[PDB]
């Protein structure tokens, strides 16, 4: 008997998350 439980990149961020961006005012 062999069992494998595999989970990867769960709720993970590998990119850009930005609330807001303003070049100027």
Footprint of a copy of itself (CB under 8 A): 1-25
Q: How far is the CB of 25 from a copy of itself (least distance, A)?
A: 5
Q: How far is the CB of 13 from a copy of itself (least distance, A)?
A: 5
Q: Which token pair is 15?
A: 């990119």
Q: How far is the CB of 20 from a copy of itself (least distance, A)?
A: 4
Give the side-chain half-sphere CA count within 13 A for 12.
5
Name the one residue in this structure whose structure tokens are 């998350």. Answer: 17
């Amino acid at each position: 008997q062999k069992l494998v439980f595999f989970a990867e990149d769960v709720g993970s961020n590998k990119g850009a998350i930005i609330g807001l961006m303003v070049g100027g005012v």
